[PDB]
Ligand binder design. Structure first.
Ligand SMILES: Cc1cc2c(cc1C)N(C[C@H](O)[C@H](O)[C@H](O)COP(=O)(O)OP(=O)(O)OC[C@H]1O[C@@H](n3cnc4c(N)ncnc43)[C@H](O)[C@@H]1O)c1[nH]c(=O)[nH]c(=O)c1N2
Ligand SMILES: Cc1cc2c(cc1C)N(C[C@H](O)[C@H](O)[C@H](O)COP(=O)(O)OP(=O)(O)OC[C@H]1O[C@@H](n3cnc4c(N)ncnc43)[C@H](O)[C@@H]1O)c1[nH]c(=O)[nH]c(=O)c1N2
Ligand SMILES: NC(=O)CC[C@H](N)C(=O)O
Ligand SMILES: NC(=O)CC[C@H](N)C(=O)O
Lengths: 531, 537
């Protein structure tokens, strides 16, 4: 018995961690020279200890925890338990979703304000009546999303699936089409009992999410609200990893080596050695070499699997459709090393201090979201590194064209655009920021052969029609699909962990069911249902 | 009336900007074209393989034109693409138009779906029963089902063009909040003649429609785009044409036409970074364009820059209203990639598969659910003594192009090799050959991702639901006290077509003449049409 784990991301490392705790031989195959996958920390040369930024995962809305690292039940409990399992609980530092001092900025339609100041951002001129403005985007979206989210939260807490069954009856809706054809405002809002216009819906998307978010599945909007802790009775502890998210996969890998990795070997084929023999082993071609395994746990993204020769893996017609149709979403990040943390110590062109510690600013300008670092803020060498832009959907697609061109002329265009946008958001001059710029690093997860997209971001119908097919194995039960796409926590580490739990669960179920009690004891009776 | 210093700055030497200059030159209106790159044509982009023959090129962007019928003199019947046909005739290119074979001119192209291979027209179900598609839906077929849903909208829009009305568009806009998917999921009911249950299609069935009708993710964009695409494809009959030597001949011929009298020089290699009024408080303020680090002043400006490109330009002092500035961000663009491969021979025309069956393909296309999605065999040069050895091995849209894009333009040999092997493998499975049969014949590969290109920032406009009804009209109004005119194919209902760019230039110039020199309108109408879209009378 020997399990081939494809991909040394967090999902594959977690799978190996489970298999090692159960004394199951395994081997991890990784295409690159690095572990962590979309846990990717870039450290700027010539910078200080905290002059890094996380190009992928950077923030974890964990449940509350005690002094020993025991976490309350919650959406992200499995992530917290993983930290504690690895002895990392005390290495978790606060992540400030909002600024820890003065609030971050909002810059929309040329109107600048602080978060919480109640600006309308010229919405009346956009055709938003005063009643909608008074209610606000947040309350409106909560009224539409809340009912679905509460039912899904009840599923997790009460161990039911009726909430998901109801979500799936509405899975053909995008968030937009739900607002356009189904949602009617709560009578307490005192609004007309009619569906919102596209103008109003686009106003919601502008301040609620990203350009084009609402054209993807309504179910994803509901699941994101649950992941961000906008529903339920428990509160979240926003955390990040001291030194960058890379510490998590590096710590797991070091744990596994003291007891295994095939690096620099990209998988090009997966299939049964002989599809007609019932006891046929799996064959993985990686780095031009054939490797045999009893079972294979794949954590490769779905678009990557579409580049792998899966003949003799005997996918059924639904599984093969799912690999193509289950939708991914894009994302870009731009990190800038400055000479100082001007957002914390500086002032705008009028002498007003920014007074920002951690937190984020938002704008309809191309950069969309600015994320100020929470790590190291209280040390004697605070971070000088800013996430100048963090984009999703259309905003990331458009910005991606200026990233990774390899041409200085477009690198200069990109920097000038980002600094110009930053200047407008914070009310400074361009040169004030240019004089302080040291280095720029940019990344497009939608222009990366190892991800082929930032993460799963399902369109309408994906969850109800195609998602379950990939939780069934292929290759006569010997190929198991895992990775964050195989979860209801897309674009989160916990999604990858859930997928690894289910894949190993199915592996143990068909090969050594006597290990299930210990599996349940160490890693949970269920992937998602709360303890 | 018109000031003596009138001069229109045209931003972008693509087909929209070249057409604008052609109109203005015919009306004796001074202009100047500012272009960021060292080439003209924009998304008319022909790649010539150096080691190949005369017809060893492929069009990375525009390549096929569903024109109306035409007579021997180059007079085109009324139709969606008449404006394109007349442009060809105006430039003396009518006889340089050669057939474009949308379907193969000999044996049909291939379909390869769910591991089942068949020829177009053979009536295969591609294992759809295993997918849960009942026999009634299969017997009807995807094409008839889609036509039943799209037909009513398309017929109303065609009636608009022919009868010179807008009720068809107004009715389309009543449904513009629908994506194609949400329309099928929540509104469409099958025609009683189909004998199907009077219920909305399931997601499984809708995804079956998208699989064979368009591209992965197409149906999540606006229903209106699906309707407008069916109209553009001619669903009067169309004469599919392409341009001998590649689509680059069209913009090259316009540039030569504008240059004949020794003037109308183009400002090349000058990327626009700012557009605005010199003094937004003065009513007579001229426009200022900063391009290549130089300030240039114009009375009016016609922009053909893509909407995502305008979002990288400093538009302070252009005084866009709140709707216009929202439109620049939200009006959605779509992706596309193409992969051209020079082979040693036109094996699709002369070769045979692993079982000895000849492909016998001349022009036309093959389709598959594999990553390459669409294969396009060349129609140009097929009858000459040196036919093309160049294949469009992959032409993708939406999700298929987004995924494939990650393998294009990486700059690393290892990913160039991965890409080639994937493409050849897909091609081998589509045509029923082995990988090595195609590898032995491969000479050179060229790949392009219009969604990773600073000059386009997307392949073309591909609006989401609500874009046409909410934000589209805002950009047909000028900005900058009437002196900034938005043009380019995004400013049309023929997105992803040359005619869209031409329509946008007509409307922009029409608005310029309307506010600056109305005496030129009769000649403008005479030479370039009384309306942008309405059929000629
Ligand atoms: C921009 C951005 C931002 C965030 C996030 C993602 C992104 C892209 N996420 C999500 C989180 O990063 C993600 O869900 C998981 O890291 C995914 O882990 P997997 O193991 O599923 O895949 P992942 O892609 O990480 O790992 C797959 C592995 O397979 C390898 N591989 C690829 N092709 C191969 C081939 N052919 N052969 C062999 N190996 C191959 C890759 O190199 C990689 O090592 C996140 N999460 C969170 O909790 N908090 C957050 O704040 C964020 N934010
Ligand atoms: C892959 C693919 C395939 C097709 C098509 C497109 C694509 C991408 N099309 C659509 C057609 O190609 C397209 O609609 C028009 O060529 C667009 O012409 P525009 O003038 O609107 O823009 P276009 O993008 O062509 O021109 C804009 C110009 O502005 C320049 N520019 C950009 N940024 C600038 C800056 N900052 N400053 C100055 N200049 C700047 C660019 O370099 C370019 O010269 C098509 N159509 C058709 O009829 N038949 C077909 O078969 C196809 N197929
Ligand atoms: N849908 C998502 O949650 C994507 C965002 C990502 N999880 C983040 O924390 O930024
Ligand atoms: N929507 C579209 O028409 C995109 C396709 C493109 N016009 C072509 O025929 O190649």
């Amino acid at each position: 018995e020997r399990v081939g784990i494809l991909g040394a991301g967090i999902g594959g490392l977690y799978s190996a961690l489970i298999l090692q705790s159960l004394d199951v031989p395994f081997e991890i195959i990784e295409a690159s020279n690095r572990v962590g996958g979309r846990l990717f920390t870039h450290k700027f040369p010539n910078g200080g200890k905290y002059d890094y930024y996380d190009v992928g995962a950077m923030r974890y809305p964990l449940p509350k925890s005690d002094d020993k690292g025991n976490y309350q039940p919650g959406v992200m409990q499995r992530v917290g338990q993983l930290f504690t399992y690895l002895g990392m609980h005390k290495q978790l530092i606060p992540y400030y979703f909002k600024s820890n001092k003065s609030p971050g900025f909002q810059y929309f339609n040329g109107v600048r304000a602080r978060i919480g100041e109640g600006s309308s951002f010229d919405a009346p001129a956009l055709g938003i009546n005063s009643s909608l403005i008074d209610i606000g985007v947040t309350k409106i979206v909560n009224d539409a999303v809340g009912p679905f989210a509460q039912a899904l939260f009840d599923d997790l807490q009460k161990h039911t699936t009726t909430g998901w069954d109801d979500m799936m009856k509405n899975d053909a809706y995008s968030t937009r089409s739900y607002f356009s054809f189904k949602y009617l405002p709560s009578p307490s809002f005192g609004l007309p009992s009619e569906h919102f216009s596209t103008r109003v819906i686009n106003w919601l998307e502008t301040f609620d999410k990203s350009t084009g978010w609402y054209d993807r599945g309504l179910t994803e909007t509901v699941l994101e609200a649950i992941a961000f802790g906008e529903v339920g009775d428990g509160e979240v502890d926003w955390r990040c990893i001291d030194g960058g998210s890379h510490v998590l996969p590096d710590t797991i890998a070091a744990f596994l080596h003291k007891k295994a990795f095939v690096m620099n070997a990209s998988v090009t084929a997966i299939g049964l050695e002989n599809p007609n023999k019932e006891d046929s082993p799996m064959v993985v071609v990686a780095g031009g070499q054939k490797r045999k395994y009893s079972h294979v746990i794949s954590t490769l993204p779905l678009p990557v699997l579409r580049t792998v020769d899966l003949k003799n893996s005997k996918l059924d017609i639904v599984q093969s459709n799912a690999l193509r149709k289950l939708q991914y979403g894009p994302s870009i990040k731009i990190g800038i090393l400055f000479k100082e943390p001007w957002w914390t110590t500086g002032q705008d062109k009028n002498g007003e201090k920014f007074d920002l510690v951690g937190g984020q600013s938002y704008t309809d300008l191309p950069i969309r979201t600015v994320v100020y670092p929470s790590y190291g803020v209280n040390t004697n060498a605070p971070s000088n590194t800013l996430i100048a832009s963090y984009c999703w959907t259309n905003d990331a697609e458009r910005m991606g064209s200026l990233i990774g061109t390899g041409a200085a002329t477009y690198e200069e265009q990109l920097e000038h655009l980002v600094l110009s946008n930053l200047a407008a958001v914070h009310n400074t001059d361009y040169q004030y920021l240019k004089d302080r710029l040291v280095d720029v690093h940019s990344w497009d997860w939608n222009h990366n052969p190892l991800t082929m997209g930032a993460f799963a971001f399902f369109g309408p119908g994906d969850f109800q029609d195609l998602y379950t097919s990939l939780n069934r194995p292929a290759a006569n039960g010997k190929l198991h699909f895992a990775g964050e796409a195989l979860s209801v926590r897309h674009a989160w580490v916990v999604g990858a962990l859930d997928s690894a739990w289910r894949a190993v669960y199915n592996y143990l179920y068909v090969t050594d069911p006597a290990k299930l009690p210990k599996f349940f004891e160490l890693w949970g009776k269920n992937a998602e249902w709360f303890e």
